[PDB]
């Protein structure tokens, strides 16, 4: 709960092709990290989630190691 | 409330449905 | 035969423990369970039973020349570290520990609860 980077005027854009940004918020085994730890806001967690999920379906991230 | 009132009414409900089941074919006869 | 490197698959549930040593592809070359050790009944799930099954299965695998084995565990049984430590005592010189337990993504309905 330190802060929501994404939720920053100075923050990136969440896409389902930027595999890099997502690694930051998925675990060592696909798990989408929670919001308590990651710290993100509610609106943007919802984003990382729909991203990680779409990505996995276009085969850019493991469906879980 | 207390559950005694509910299981007091439940027994009358349970007993009555049994009576309808047992007399299901006889009721359809005298109902003609 | 003669295969120096292989894989060990340990399945340990609340009722039993099955150890099978395999080639790097998956073919079974030596298997031994707690029931094949001699236990029968509720004793299959005990830590003692798993230790003997791994000891017996490793002995048969050493007869075929396996020298190093890679271990995959699966199941909630108590005899998991006991199955591993028995493979060390026989001297199979285990490789890396892993863990492959099938967890569904909310698929089929679990059976009725127990009272």
């Amino acid at each position: 709960t330190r802060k929501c980077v994404f939720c920053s005027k100075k923050g990136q854009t969440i896409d389902y092709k930027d595999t890099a940004l997502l690694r930051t918020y998925i675990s060592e085994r696909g798990k989408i990290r929670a919001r308590r730890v990651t710290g993100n806001c509610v609106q943007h967690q919802r984003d990382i989630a729909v991203a990680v999920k779409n990505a996995r379906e276009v085969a850019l991230l493991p469906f879980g190691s | 409330g207390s559950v005694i009132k509910k299981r007091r009414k439940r027994m009358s409900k349970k007993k009555h449905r049994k009576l309808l089941r047992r007399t299901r074919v006889q009721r359809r006869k005298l109902g003609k | 035969k003669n295969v120096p490197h292989g894989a060990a698959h340990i399945k340990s549930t609340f009722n039993n423990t099955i150890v099978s040593i395999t080639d790097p592809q998956g073919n079974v070359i030596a298997w031994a369970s707690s029931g094949h050790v001699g236990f029968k009944g509720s004793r299959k799930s005990t830590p003692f039973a798993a230790q003997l099954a791994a000891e017996n299965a490793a002995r048969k695998a050493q007869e075929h020349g396996v020298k190093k084995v890679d271990v995959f565990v699966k199941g909630p049984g108590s005899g998991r570290e006991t199955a591993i430590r028995s493979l060390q005592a026989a001297g199979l010189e285990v490789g890396t520990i892993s863990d492959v337990t099938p967890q569904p993504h909310n698929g089929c309905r679990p059976p009725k609860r127990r009272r």
């Binding site: - | - | 005990t46 830590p47 003692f48 108590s78 430590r85 005592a89």
Partner: protein
């Protein structure tokens, strides 16, 4: 108990040998208030270790001090719901006991009549450290290292 005890009797230094380590054993091997007869054996049992080997009883102190040294074994608990063993640091009182139960107390079964020459023979073997009693010390040695990697609880 529930608070913590104290060592009541003191390990008094020996009057003729000046070693509480001997004092540990003369009272550890004992009978029905027979410190008179216990005095007879405990000096009549290292007596052969003085003469049969030829080395003085001070050397008898040295050899049996270093020959039978289990000094660290394992012990059971509730852990695992079974007989899981964890190594524990033990005072050598439970170490000489490991040999005492096969010592001159048990050395009767070997065909060794002529009362105390056999009890001198065993404490002679107690000096040896390769005799009959050390087997259990070896038996628990192989048992402790049978569960060698079972110390992660470390009680």
């Amino acid at each position: 108990p529930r608070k913590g005890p104290a060592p009541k009797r003191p390990l008094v230094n020996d009057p003729v040998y000046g070693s509480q380590l001997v004092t540990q054993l003369v009272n550890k091997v004992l009978l029905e208030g027979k410190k008179s007869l216990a005095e007879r054996i405990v000096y009549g049992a290292l007596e052969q270790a003085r003469e049969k080997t030829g080395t003085d009883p001070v050397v008898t102190l040295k050899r049996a001090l270093d020959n039978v040294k289990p000094a660290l074994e394992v012990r059971s608990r509730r852990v695992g719901g079974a007989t899981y063993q964890v190594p524990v640091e033990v005072r050598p009182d439970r170490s000489t006991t490991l040999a005492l139960r096969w010592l001159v107390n048990f050395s009767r079964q070997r065909r060794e009549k002529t009362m105390v020459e056999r009890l001198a023979n065993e404490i002679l073997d107690a000096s040896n450290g390769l005799g009959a009693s050390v087997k259990r010390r070896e038996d628990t040695h192989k048992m402790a290292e049978a569960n060698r990697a079972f110390a992660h609880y470390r009680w």
